Design an enzyme around this catalytic site. Structure first.
Site, PDB file in Angstrom:
ATOM      1  N   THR C  12     -32.183  19.024  -6.614  1.00 28.27           N
ATOM      2  CA  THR C  12     -31.583  18.680  -5.336  1.00 28.27           C
ATOM      3  C   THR C  12     -31.159  17.224  -5.306  1.00 28.27           C
ATOM      4  O   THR C  12     -30.159  16.866  -4.666  1.00 28.27           O
ATOM      5  CB  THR C  12     -32.592  18.950  -4.218  1.00 28.27           C
ATOM      6  OG1 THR C  12     -32.810  20.365  -4.114  1.00 28.27           O
ATOM      7  CG2 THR C  12     -32.064  18.426  -2.897  1.00 28.27           C
ATOM      8  N   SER C  51     -34.087  23.312 -11.094  1.00 24.26           N
ATOM      9  CA  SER C  51     -35.349  23.379 -11.824  1.00 24.26           C
ATOM     10  C   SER C  51     -36.024  24.732 -11.695  1.00 24.26           C
ATOM     11  O   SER C  51     -36.994  24.980 -12.416  1.00 24.26           O
ATOM     12  CB  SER C  51     -36.295  22.268 -11.381  1.00 24.26           C
ATOM     13  OG  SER C  51     -36.803  22.509 -10.098  1.00 24.26           O
ATOM     14  N   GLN C  52     -35.555  25.612 -10.804  1.00 20.23           N
ATOM     15  CA  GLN C  52     -36.046  26.980 -10.853  1.00 20.23           C
ATOM     16  C   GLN C  52     -35.609  27.694 -12.121  1.00 20.23           C
ATOM     17  O   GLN C  52     -36.188  28.728 -12.462  1.00 20.23           O
ATOM     18  CB  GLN C  52     -35.558  27.791  -9.646  1.00 20.23           C
ATOM     19  CG  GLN C  52     -34.089  28.027  -9.601  1.00 20.23           C
ATOM     20  CD  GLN C  52     -33.396  26.960  -8.776  1.00 20.23           C
ATOM     21  OE1 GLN C  52     -33.599  25.771  -8.989  1.00 20.23           O
ATOM     22  NE2 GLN C  52     -32.586  27.385  -7.814  1.00 20.23           N
ATOM     23  N   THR C  82     -37.546  19.513  -7.849  1.00 23.38           N
ATOM     24  CA  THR C  82     -38.923  19.499  -7.362  1.00 23.38           C
ATOM     25  C   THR C  82     -39.656  20.812  -7.591  1.00 23.38           C
ATOM     26  O   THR C  82     -40.887  20.821  -7.553  1.00 23.38           O
ATOM     27  CB  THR C  82     -38.958  19.140  -5.884  1.00 23.38           C
ATOM     28  OG1 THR C  82     -38.421  20.225  -5.115  1.00 23.38           O
ATOM     29  CG2 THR C  82     -38.155  17.861  -5.646  1.00 23.38           C
ATOM     30  N   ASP C  83     -38.942  21.920  -7.811  1.00 20.12           N
ATOM     31  CA  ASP C  83     -39.615  23.213  -7.832  1.00 20.12           C
ATOM     32  C   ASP C  83     -40.574  23.335  -9.013  1.00 20.12           C
ATOM     33  O   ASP C  83     -41.700  23.835  -8.842  1.00 20.12           O
ATOM     34  CB  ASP C  83     -38.599  24.353  -7.832  1.00 20.12           C
ATOM     35  CG  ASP C  83     -37.872  24.474  -6.505  1.00 20.12           C
ATOM     36  OD1 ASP C  83     -38.164  23.687  -5.580  1.00 20.12           O
ATOM     37  OD2 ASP C  83     -36.998  25.354  -6.388  1.00 20.12           O
TER      38      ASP C  83
END
Ligand code: ASP
Ligand code: ASP
Lengths: 295, 323, 309, 300
Positions: C12, C51-52, C82-83
């Site tokens: 993000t 990052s997923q 961040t995930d």
């Protein structure tokens, strides 16, 4: 669109809706005082019919005190939403724009009415009574530590899942034509705590004293004695320096024997707010304690 | 087995009331009866009753008595466990953290429920405290608090809740290790100087410098600070709002107190986070000291000891930047 | 001034509803002119993804880059989603042979948003990457004014900018204006690990199974059918498993598969069966460590010792 | 005294209950809560619904899946009398075993009428918790059970409860879910997401023709590319797919990174994976339409 009026009172925040902006005063909330409180409430009660809702930008430092005072003095059933910022507006990643954004959303939402005075910080709607400043620096500092938030805000929508049962229309405190408040001070409790502070407030004939007790509102022995003599001769509410949880009756302190008032979940600042208003109508500990069990 | 000296001071651990009803008194039960409540200790070989009081009446004399015991009897035991009230344990634990010159695991423990209560938490807490004190890996960790199966350091431990048995938390930097099946997996150690690394020697002190704490709130009255100044207090801590600010009244009196020699430390009623320098208050400008992460009760402890070695606001500011 | 190299993977922080990993690394740097006052920032776009979708190949690339270029710069900052940052950070914590600061940073709000958090996150990450006090703490994650260790940092909240927390043992230091470091991780890290990925181009296959009432055992069996090297159980309570799932992992362990018991319960250790208790590691972090261990041994006894690390 | 029925799923030992209620015990089942399953749920709900008679219920349950049973009962119990769940984090043999005072307080809560019309409740270590938001936060802590998103309903002190909140979502009597006529629940499983996540666990559920699948996604309900590909085809074959999150706090919202309505997904809101499964199973008893399921998930 609904009309929401922004009332500015100060704070780092400077230092859907048809939004109008008015600056009532401009002070650091660390200098917050009775006069601004009486002015702020009188303003909102007077302009209640003239708008659809209020958003108040404020210093975060005493935000919890102002919010609780308005929660107990605002007779405007229209949303009153308090908002602030932890980072300066010129600073990088300033948090205030989206906070104020979310506050107008909260103030614009028809579901928000009748939830009392609200505080909107970091995507979250917090109730005026339970909100407190948790951290000295975090942008997520505001929390309802005992009972939790009323709703979360996402993409301009609020999922409300709580409402406070303990405010606003339902309170008996009417400060409309009032220009002073009863004197209430706060004394800190600690090991080997000095009585010098409480003795100073009693000698000045203060209307009330809040105890920032330890644990379940306990007092240092010197302090307890002195407050025992004052309450029995000044109103004394037992609260706690402990950030979370109730100061209960029926623990280690017979309040009746001493004429103390257990502050419940109210922390020392918020207990002060409620004691101040209670002393406008009565001075009996047995009566006050009933006020503290409902607000 | 290791020899653990249990020093009893009172507390709801040593308190009774009925198991149902919630009225109770503290600093009742004698130590010897707490040892017996926990049959499963023969872990170590259990002791002395120093005082038996509610920790809300904790004071310098009991602090000084505690430090003098630990330092004089350090070589006679393997570690100590101090049974204590939960109300000021964070204060006592921090003072000892600054004044104990032993290595032995000095582990403080208390209970949120009276020993007469149903599901009293004290027996199993005291168990884990002994466990903590007996594991020498706990050595060189400073004064510890072991509560609700958790090992905490004396500097960061604080009481989060008025009633919860999980009341104690190191809110700013977190716990040192967790206890399972009589075993501690330690993954942290505090960085600030403690115990044996402090410049404070209480061997010849029978009283501490006078330090009081003033609370900050809207419209705050300055009579408590004026009372503490008029009383010649050596130090004054303000539980400030937010990042340690003061109401105009209170800042006024302390400005004058600091200029005529009083130590003035800016802390925060806000339970977590540092009270930092260079924010809204210029501490070098009024000879003030920012308390850092130390909450007001803990800030009092540090200023009291600091006033045994120095009265320089520049010098105190580093004592607070180092301990 | 120090030389800090920024390795970008997306997130993000690099995004713009919203999409992840749109913005490039020079534009994350651009956006904060103040980095010019603190370090000589250079940048590399490793990948640009959400990052997923983070995966082993990216993990191996990052570790080799950090390992090979350690002598070329003074410290690294990795911009990341961040995930799964808690996974990548813990993977790097165990595979980087570089002692210099390796700092991960992200944003919960897009670069386009009001009150975008990435600029100040990335600034504080460079400060941390520049401070000499940060070195030898292992791989760090800097989010919302705080330095967090790669081992214990986890994502606590779905939307909060303050989501990242070391929930079991707490942050290492706080950043104001220049870091108050008071903690350091005791488990071994970075140059102190037995894990060498330099010449690896794939990692052992480790999956995660969730436990709940009436849990189906088909997901565990699928991983058994694929001959996965390891299975982490996201158990209930203190690492407990639903009956049928416990049966299948009993068969998987008995036929050579490593089985680690973790918990979906977000806080606390899964405690010490010829299974491996994950300790305080949550399932995704337990996964990364189990992955690495299966590069050195497949002995459950030796694997449990690894987890006590 | 009110008559309280304690339904045991896994006594004389606490005599002080008898100061608060006229206890009936009854062993509905005898199980570890990690083995909790639909059948115990269907029996628990049907039992409570028929015996709703008594003045209140207390359900003793293992702590590991209590949050699932509490939510399931929260949505299917039609009795307006208090239904209180309680367990122990420590065995009764322990030094400081917590079960006695927990059980004490559960009976106190269940006997208090102020507890009625708050849905199914969880009473653990001195707190009244609502069945929907309550979850197990810590692996061993006695203070483990807590409402992380929206908070507790009241605190119990001295056998008195200060209720200051009630949950706004529909529960119990206001739900259209009637399990009375069901002998099975729709098959709904949970798959975890992490870096490099395999799609074999989700494809196993699609291959077995499950009605519903909950994704314990990363962040705001996101999926690894493999898993998304798979859940998309499953939604394409009429499977319900709900997006939840392995992150313990916060809602998995709509309008983030996944166009739910395009694929036919449902955002779980604050319901965590196991709880989202409970509601999707019941949602599948009334409809198989993603707009209606998503609405349902904004309703409960
Ligand atoms: N007043 C008691 C409370 C407790 O021990 O929990 C004390 O601190 O001594
Ligand atoms: N990579 C993450 C970034 C974030 O959410 O902050 C994502 O794709 O969702």
């Amino acid at each position: 669109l609904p009309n929401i009026t922004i009332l500015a009172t100060g704070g780092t925040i400077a230092g859907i809706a048809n939004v109008k902006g008015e600056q009532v005063v401009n002070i650091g909330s660390q200098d917050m005082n009775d006069n601004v409180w009486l002015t702020l409430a009188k303003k909102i009660n007077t302009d209640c019919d003239k708008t659809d809702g209020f958003v108040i930008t404020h210093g975060t430092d005493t935000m919890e005190e102002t919010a609780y005072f308005l929660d107990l003095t605002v007779k405007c059933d229209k949303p009153v939403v308090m908002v602030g910022a932890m980072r300066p507006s010129t600073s990088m990643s300033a948090d205030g724009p989206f906070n104020l954004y979310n506050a107008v959303v909260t103030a614009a939402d028809k579901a928000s009415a009748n939830r009392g005075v609200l505080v909107v910080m970091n995507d979250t709607v917090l109730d005026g009574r339970d909100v407190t400043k948790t951290n000295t620096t975090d942008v997520a500092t505001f929390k309802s530590v005992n009972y939790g938030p009323l709703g979360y805000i996402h993409n301009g929508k609020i999922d409300y899942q709580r409402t406070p049962a303990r405010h606003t229309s339902d309170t008996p405190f009417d400060v409309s034509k009032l220009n002073e408040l009863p004197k209430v001070g706060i004394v800190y409790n600690y090991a080997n705590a000095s009585d010098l502070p409480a003795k100073a407030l009693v000698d000045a004939g203060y209307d009330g004293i809040v105890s920032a007790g330890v644990g379940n509102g306990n007092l240092y022995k010197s302090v307890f004695d002195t407050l025992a003599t004052a309450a029995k001769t000044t109103a004394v509410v037992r609260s706690s320096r402990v950030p979370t949880g109730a100061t209960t009756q029926d623990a280690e302190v017979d309040d009746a024997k001493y004429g103390f008032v257990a502050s419940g979940t109210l922390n020392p600042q918020k207990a002060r707010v409620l004691l101040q208003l209670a002393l406008t109508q009565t001075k009996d500990p047995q009566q006050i304690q009933q006020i503290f069990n409902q607000y």
